[PDB]
Design a protein around this ligand. Structure first.
Ligand SMILES: [Cu+2]
Ligand SMILES: [Cu+2]
Ligand SMILES: [Cu+2]
Ligand SMILES: [Cu+2]
Ligand SMILES: [Cu+2]
Ligand SMILES: [Cu+2]
Lengths: 336, 336, 336
């Protein structure tokens, strides 16, 4: 169908780690689905010792919100760059065809907006990110990425074509940060975004992140802000990394069905311990919880997780199952 | 079935690179398979110039021994932490469901042991590793990991369901080491395990290993200690990396059938040159030897292999095959 | 069949990024396909500020030329090492079985040549590279690698066995370079190849490349030297990385069908945003162009691409398609 003649619908976005309400399988025909995002440059505290990032975001968050459509829909995004920002921006959708993903059609200076339409003709989770000419990696590593999820119109399927269904979706964006230090060994704090540029590029070129965080900060997905679920619930875990490889793992769980390359027309793999998200992509995993407790969800380079920040928690309610796992003898003195 | 009512069997473990005797396809029903491992902290010489590691091991070796069961069996491990060790330990089985892989149920101080049961309900090769709260990567990178192999009850299968069988299995654990240097440019030697901690964490955070070794040392799987096979023999090569990615390759061979993500319910890939083991996982490859000679088996980041240590040898006996490869003209002066 | 009795054919190689003329599906029976390559050591300018590399090449180029045969053919290579070179060399074909890929049969000192035959019995794209004992990574990272493509005799196929066909093939070799600096912070320029060795090995061991280039130089595949195509044309993009992982991406496009592990007997994946080439391998992607414009083809670690050099361009002629993508509103003042 010609998109100029199709019905339009508007979606209200929600902040990560939630995902806006949506259908999996649907009876709906194709639609032009309208979204708006507003760019916010801001200084953010990213660790427990007061380190700051001169950050750049879609809609005030790292990652930007997840956009959900169905295969055959059109995405119609209005991108707003308020006059309170200092830098130009744009958007590159890996789900889109042409014009550098849309970047060439969405160059907005402070004080400007633009509106882009494209056909979501391929199912999967896809990264979107900012990409302004001459300063592409800086904008990405400072926070400007998120996920577009294009569901098959009849929902997710296993390798045999059986239906898969989730009860809740969560979105995790992983950010390799390059925070400069000065000659006193302390991280630098900058008064403006532009002042941070040259020092940051030098750190970038070492390919060694200072921090690697989920969702904007060390510990972002812990404490009051842990993810939640119940025994018997099936969760979809969307994981994006716009710049650098990562290897997700659920401690005490599995990826029941995983699309590590993120593209739903391909059969998923089962029973994964650890999967692989290529830098520049988003992938997705399903898991049905079978045990209660506080799980960790992390990058299984354990230095990247525990030392640099790439780890969160999932607090799961319900009944413990001794068939799956039992403590036969608690820690006690070695028999003599 | 309820595991409390099932038959129990005990397995005697063997040191890497061998794997304890086991059946592939079996007529046996499900069993509770009992294993014991004893933790040993020890100083180890890891290279040819006398560099030492303040190491931590399951059963005295890097990697720990490979445990083999069949899908539907229960693993029942007694983990012993003798009073001669300095640190607490535990075990996280990626093949297990709940309680941080078993880590929350197996916290043993020096002088203690514990016994854990879990259902091996998913087929594949899975990492196990130590994971004590607050010092997880240190224990892993110091040597505390190995493999649990859960075979399908009817043995390994190709994508069409045809049986695959191996004559010999070998287990290779690859260890990214972070050995500190002092201001004189020499590697540090420490009198105790605890003394090595702070300096090691600083090296870890650079994400640059000093050494990357198979099976505990540069050259461990060479010389008298090379792997062996014969023309016509099919080998299973199990490869674990609990912390960091690697890319196995057999020089002059292939991966005939490879499960790089390590999970046997998924179809394998054929004819691989180089495969990929995600940090935090174990994978497996089958190869049938067709040529005699001394092969290398290595990580194909050739700096990681030849400069940092991630390489071994396979010495293969038998008859050379000129149909597969022939020297038509030996090195000689260029025709003039 | 016995290769000694088969017909012989000779192929004239062409320089990257082109690939010599060949058939996809063929009616031909198996042949011994004869090739010649001549090693050239040379100093090369690798960036826009005059940095030089003491380089080593097959046939004068980085990568070496792509060799194309069909499954069941024999490759018969004459490798020439002229007396004007300083170092010994050889070749390791990952497509070959035995004798360290052929390296043990092809050790040529300056002034020598050798001729190797092997059966191309496995379909796929495979790396070939130099590998002289005691200095393997140096020769690889200095430029000595390329691709052998072994096509199925009936051409490429999708997961259902439907024929896939390409109109043009391009070959991209990605090279992680380790150029030393002196105490003044400038890259070193060396009078001879041997003089560069010790300083380069020290840089290698840091695992941090100074540059990461396609086809021998920053910007090699840009400007006059961009790749070209037309709307409606299907291209095969062959990507080799003999030493280090990479993650190819087409900005504004996709991998329609991708063999990321590079082995054509395995089903490809569809709709990829970004794929993964393991260090020590070659992979391949098909794409049919649907939009005109100048695309980027790059490693999607965007620091590796935009800061270190791992990026090229594809200039595509034809008609813009507003159904796939349309600018609904050009950048303009934010409504008040
Ligand atoms: Cu931006
Ligand atoms: Cu991108
Ligand atoms: Cu431990
Ligand atoms: Cu783990
Ligand atoms: Cu060479
Ligand atoms: Cu190789």
């Amino acid at each position: 169908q010609d998109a100029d003649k199709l019905p339009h619908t508007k979606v209200t976005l929600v902040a990560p780690p939630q995902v806006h309400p949506h259908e999996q399988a649907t009876k709906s025909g194709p639609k032009v689905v309208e979204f708006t995002m507003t760019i916010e440059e801001k200084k953010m505290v990213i660790d427990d010792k007061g380190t700051t990032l001169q950050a750049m975001t879609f809609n005030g968050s790292m990652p930007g919100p997840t956009l959900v459509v169905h295969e055959g829909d059109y995405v119609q995004l209005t991108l707003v760059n308020p006059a309170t920002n200092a830098m130009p921006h744009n958007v590159d959708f890996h789900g889109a065809t042409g014009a550098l993903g849309g970047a060439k059609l969405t160059n907005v200076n402070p004080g400007e907006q633009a509106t882009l339409r494209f056909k979501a003709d391929r199912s999967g989770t896809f990264v979107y990110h900012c990409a302004p000419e001459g300063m592409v990696p800086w904008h990405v590593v400072s926070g400007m990425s998120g996920t577009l999820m294009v569901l098959p119109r009849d929902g997710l399927k296993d390798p045999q074509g059986k239906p898969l269904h989730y009860d809740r979706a969560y979105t995790i964006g992983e950010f390799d940060l390059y925070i400069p230090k000065g000659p006193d060994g302390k991280y630098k704090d900058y008064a403006t975004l532009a002042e941070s540029y040259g020092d940051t590029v030098q750190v970038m070129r070492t390919l060694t992140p200072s921090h690697i965080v989920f969702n904007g900060k060390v510990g972002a997905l812990t404490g009051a802000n842990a993810l939640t679920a119940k025994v018997g619930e099936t969760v979809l875990l969307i994981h994006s990394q716009a710049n650098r490889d990562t290897r997700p793992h659920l401690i005490g769980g599995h990826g029941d069905w995983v699309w590590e390359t993120g593209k739903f027309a391909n059969p998923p793999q089962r029973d994964l311990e650890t999967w692989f998200i290529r830098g520049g992509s988003a992938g997705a995993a399903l898991y049905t919880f079978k045990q209660p407790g506080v799980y960790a969800y992390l990058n299984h380079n354990l230095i990247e997780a525990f030392e640099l920040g790439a780890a969160g928690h999932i607090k799961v309610e319900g009944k413990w199952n001794d068939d799956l796992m039992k403590q036969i003898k608690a820690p006690a003195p070695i028999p003599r």
